[PDB]
Amino acid sequence: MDYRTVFRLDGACAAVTGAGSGIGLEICRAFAASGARLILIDREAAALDRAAQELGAAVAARIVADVTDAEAMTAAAAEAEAVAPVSILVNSAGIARLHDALETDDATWRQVMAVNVDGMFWASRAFGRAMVARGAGAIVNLGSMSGTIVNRPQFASSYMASKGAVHQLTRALAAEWAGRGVRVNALAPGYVATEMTLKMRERPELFETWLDMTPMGRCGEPSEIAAAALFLASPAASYVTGAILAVDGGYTVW
Amino acid sequence: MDYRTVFRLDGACAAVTGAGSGIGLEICRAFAASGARLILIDREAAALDRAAQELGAAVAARIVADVTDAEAMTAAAAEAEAVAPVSILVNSAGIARLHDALETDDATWRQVMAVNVDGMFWASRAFGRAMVARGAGAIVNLGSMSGTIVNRPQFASSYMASKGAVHQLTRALAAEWAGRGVRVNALAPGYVATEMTLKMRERPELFETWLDMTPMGRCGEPSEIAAAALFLASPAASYVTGAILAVDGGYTVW
Amino acid sequence: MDYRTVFRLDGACAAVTGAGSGIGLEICRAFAASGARLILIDREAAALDRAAQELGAAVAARIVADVTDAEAMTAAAAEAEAVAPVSILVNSAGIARLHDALETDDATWRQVMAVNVDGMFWASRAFGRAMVARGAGAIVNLGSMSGTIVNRPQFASSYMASKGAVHQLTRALAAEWAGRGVRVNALAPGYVATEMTLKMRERPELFETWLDMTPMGRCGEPSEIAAAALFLASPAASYVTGAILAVDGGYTVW
Amino acid sequence: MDYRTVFRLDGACAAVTGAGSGIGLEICRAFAASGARLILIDREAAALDRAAQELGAAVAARIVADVTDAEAMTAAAAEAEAVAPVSILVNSAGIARLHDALETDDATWRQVMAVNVDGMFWASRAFGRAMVARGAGAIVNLGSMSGTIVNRPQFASSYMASKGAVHQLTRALAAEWAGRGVRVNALAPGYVATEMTLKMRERPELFETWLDMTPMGRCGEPSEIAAAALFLASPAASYVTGAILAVDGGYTVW
């Protein structure tokens, strides 16, 4: 057993949705640094531009696709497989919409569920197919502490519901594919200091409550989430499947 | 503090989705026996008529409606409020479809999610509005042990994902409405001797595994799930909100 | 089943540890009101007398005993059995001590673990023996939200660990005795307005925080814990075993 | 970050209980291969001699002590602190005794709780002191799937209870010390192929059930547990605290 290289992804090809920004991009950084080749997937093709510049030779392909389009995910997987066997998938496309339950537009509910759950299933089915055939693979899904507990003070019931679905989808596929050598796990991050949540701080009433409810008294940095994703994606996690790993500064402890 | 009557529902009106069959119908029987009036909601006209026939005077209204139709849920709640103030909602409309993940029809995924999760939200938003305005109500959602664990050996990853979402939806609404006096809780049943279920033996490996995986070594009876729903619906559960109550013969203990 | 009577305990005899005060005594009131005879167990002779006086004819026996004295629990079960078959046990004896981890004296940690865990086992083994012989019984343990999450701002790591043990002990005995018809479940109450929490409730630095962390914005009343205990002990809960039921005004939801 | 070294422990000194065999020893190998120096802690050498002949220059001190003796732990930290500041603690001492609940002798119960829970608290209190004073530390507790579910078919209620306590202790200390820069996490391993558990092969009425209940269909190798401990001990887990990480081949998913 070589512990010096057990966390590496040498020789792996990893597809990452949401690759162009935030957590997906930092996960790409981690994976690249660890020897993986990348299939970058995003709907914002210029956020892809940014990523490919940074990741250089580690990029095997850049694919523009909406995860909510099942046909487009099946196509992305066929295109990726033609470049190299995809042995890792990271589902890091996810959105959040603030809404009071009683005032929720039907479209808001459907949009969040479609991206966060359905899109995860479309990508997992598409990319998982060849992993299952090969009897080898690792899937890391971006769940949330929102799949375990309910945020405060803001309301976003569709987010909570979608992340509950993400955690059970993770486990469902872990169970179904364990016998065929594909591991499936989720991260459950707390608040993460992405450009996007850091602006969500023009609102001290929200932000101060978030910090006060986190034992570490801070948001997680994107790299702290990526380092956990790297662990779950690597052979270090060879006996880890169907796990929901909290990376939340202690948020779910209280 | 009259413990002899604290589980009763005299003077309350309960709306029940999926009232026509299985667990929803047994819940109706339990609630009627406990003094409640009933708004029966189901997509099947013939089933509703049978249900109404047996339930007699306890029925305040019967509404043929599809829980996946948001507009129909909103109209059902307006109709019900005209006929009786609804202070209890039971979301027992659910479906289950067997599918191997890699062989899943997109429509199968969508329909399971639509009924199990979106429908529960549409009904909860619709009927919950007036509860929240009055500052009083109780909602009981039919979750599942499938919201907590993954069944074996059969595969139904949409069911698992939908039930993860149901458990978190329950909790999100619990948190949002707690200050306005509306409690929202879920049952997580094990295997229950219903149609949904007894039609699966019908693959003879299934039942023997199920029972071997259940400490009590038997399926639950619908009446056993209904008695638990009655607890959560009643004033006995006045300090219970956002709870997921396992009623599974110990299945999730092992 | 007959729902009008499914929550009743007529014909039953329940042993309750911690019967002299608080939740235990309220559970005794609830069980007596529901038709049960009672075995009162408490280390405080004077408190037990007051309880016995109040509870009247419902009291079959009163046993002055320390749950940490395993030999006394053994004799107490033999004494009770000579008087009536005990078919229900409630383990409500329990203590909380505030201590900072680094400034913890060995004896504080020992005593909390001894009363809360060891004593629950001594009493369960003792009273459980004849239930298992008979093929029928129901046990209800007082766990806590502190078996799931960690209280704030006060520290009491021994209490947290003890309640983590209570929850697993509950489930362990549920699994082991399921085949012999003995259900074993736990309640996980949030803050409750008792003697246990009386002083702390005077300190606003603690109490404001407790209320702000509780979605219902109040402690539960003893009767609201007792009503849930009654449910678990009754035939209504006949398919519930190994469950941990949160009765915490939504505390563990956030 | 950088990701090439984020999993390393160069310049750290780690104290490991149960270091002479099984998981504790494999963790020592993992930590040594990652640049750590080691305080080896176990009850009799060798044990520790053969561990030192193996681990070479990595060993800073070898301390013989009983984790159940609160004074031996306090002393042990003091001795270790004289050789090197200890920035990492791994509580890998643990025992399991088979016993049916109704055939349980008091000393069996007390001993399992004393090694698994009390011993963990004494070690954490003792080694935690200097960490909290230095505002930096990481503690990895060996929990178990047995702290989440109940094993089958064998009975060992003290092991389950003790492991529930380990999970909650881990969390309590995470909450208490979050503000003082000490992270505290637990692993929850499934069955691990230590020499001890490999002897069960051997008893196929046990072993074959164990494998049938594990989605991966095999026990984990000690290195698979150690790689996960290394993750939690390392800067890669800097936003992970109060987490229970399942490493169980999916055991707790079903």
Ligand SMILES: NC(=O)c1ccc[n+]([C@@H]2O[C@H](COP(=O)([O-])OP(=O)(O)OC[C@H]3O[C@@H](n4cnc5c(N)ncnc54)[C@H](O)[C@@H]3O)[C@@H](O)[C@H]2O)c1
């Ligand atoms: N506080 C937090 O940031 C937080 C908390 C809990 C969970 N998460 C989860 O972590 C993951 C990463 O989020 P982030 O913070 O990096 O986001 P971000 O705001 O930094 O960027 C969002 C990215 O998702 C992409 N995207 C959105 N919809 C898409 C679609 N349909 N198809 C393809 N790409 C799409 C966008 O183009 C963009 O690049 C998400 O799954 C999120 O749900 C985040």
Ligand SMILES: NC(=O)c1ccc[n+]([C@@H]2O[C@H](COP(=O)([O-])OP(=O)(O)OC[C@H]3O[C@@H](n4cnc5c(N)ncnc54)[C@H](O)[C@@H]3O)[C@@H](O)[C@H]2O)c1
């Ligand atoms: N083993 C089990 O049967 C089991 C276990 C755990 C949880 N549950 C859940 O409990 C609930 C009750 O189901 P059941 O077990 O009685 O199954 P069942 O087949 O006996 O009854 C299903 C009922 O839901 C109704 N329904 C379906 N779609 C509807 C729609 N769109 N609008 C209105 N009504 C609709 C059907 O008409 C029928 O009356 C479901 O939510 C189910 O997911 C069932």
Ligand SMILES: NC(=O)c1ccc[n+]([C@@H]2O[C@H](COP(=O)([O-])OP(=O)(O)OC[C@H]3O[C@@H](n4cnc5c(N)ncnc54)[C@H](O)[C@@H]3O)[C@@H](O)[C@H]2O)c1
């Ligand atoms: N905030 C709360 O009140 C709260 C919340 C969650 C869980 N709980 C748990 O509920 C249970 C009951 O608490 P309560 O509110 O009634 O507390 P209380 O202090 O009001 O009553 C506790 C009773 O237990 C008895 N007792 C203590 N040690 C004993 C021993 N060694 N042997 C026999 N009897 C003993 C005491 O004499 C007293 O009569 C306990 O297990 C407690 O941990 C309490």
Ligand SMILES: NC(=O)c1ccc[n+]([C@@H]2O[C@H](COP(=O)([O-])OP(=O)(O)OC[C@H]3O[C@@H](n4cnc5c(N)ncnc54)[C@H](O)[C@@H]3O)[C@@H](O)[C@H]2O)c1
């Ligand atoms: N199947 C498994 O191996 C399994 C499953 C779940 C959890 N765990 C947990 O993993 C951890 C390590 O297990 P393992 O497989 O290495 O066990 P092991 O028996 O192989 O080694 C355990 C070590 O603990 C030491 N120890 C025992 N009592 C001690 C005491 N009183 N003082 C000091 N040292 C003592 C022993 O000397 C031994 O070296 C334990 O905490 C165990 O509870 C193991």
Ligand SMILES: OC[C@@H](O)[C@@H](O)CO
């Ligand atoms: O949108 C704020 C909250 O609901 C989470 O999605 C954290 O981003």
Ligand SMILES: OC[C@@H](O)[C@@H](O)CO
């Ligand atoms: O797919 C699991 C199924 O058997 C149950 O949900 C219905 O009984």
Ligand SMILES: OC[C@@H](O)[C@@H](O)CO
């Ligand atoms: O610290 C948790 C415990 O003391 C509570 O029951 C409050 O009294």
Ligand SMILES: OC[C@@H](O)[C@@H](O)CO
């Ligand atoms: O440490 C041994 C552990 O695997 C026990 O659960 C065996 O019963």
Ligand SMILES: [Mg+2]
């Ligand atoms: Mg919380």
Ligand SMILES: [Mg+2]
């Ligand atoms: Mg299980």
